[PDB]
Design a protein around this nucleic acid. Structure first.
Length: 170
DNA sequence: GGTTA
């Protein structure tokens, strides 16, 4: 079982592994890159926009989230990520800021001088409750087609992320 | 693949 110190060392390495997946810390993901890359992310939802249908283009279902982790500062909102779906509205249903969110298969690219995340068509995700909340229904029912089965390792990471987020925002 | 946002 990991504690907050190990979590921080993990993140400070830029790239880190949890189970079978390799993630990129939010801060490193914010680094401006010339060429797009595909990554996995695990952070706290610092802000979000409820799912809705795009008005133009292919009109995909879309939800925006701002992901944060201990490598950014309480002052930055984090990495802006647009999650899309062309297979119905099966996007993460987020209820409040503070929820841990794990994203699998997110394209990182440059836009207006900032790195932005764009979900791959087949992206997957895991969403946790905002543990630090008094409310007990922070994690509502989620659509199934993009859900990832997770275990205790990811559970601890989520618990720690939320805790740190809370200590730094409370 | 980066329109949609």
């Amino acid at each position: 079982v990991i504690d907050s110190l190990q979590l921080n060392e993990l993140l400070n390495a830029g790239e880190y592994k949890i189970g079978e997946l390799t993630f990129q810390s939010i801060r490193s993901s914010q680094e401006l890159q010339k060429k797009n890359t595909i990554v996995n992310l695990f952070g706290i939802v610092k802000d979000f926009t409820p799912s809705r249908q795009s008005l133009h283009g292919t009109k995909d279902w879309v939800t925006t989230v701002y992901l944060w982790d201990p490598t950014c500062d309480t002052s930055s909102i984090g990495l802006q990520i647009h999650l899309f779906s062309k297979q119905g509205n099966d996007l993460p249903v987020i209820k409040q800021v503070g929820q841990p969110l794990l994203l699998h298969q997110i394209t990182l690219r440059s836009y207006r001088d900032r790195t932005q995340g764009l979900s791959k068509d087949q992206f997957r995700y895991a969403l946790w409750p905002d543990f630090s909340s008094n409310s007990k229904d922070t994690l509502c029912p989620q659509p199934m087609p993009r859900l990832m089965k997770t275990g205790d390792k990811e559970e601890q990471f989520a618990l720690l992320l939320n805790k740190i987020w809370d200590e730094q925002t409370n």
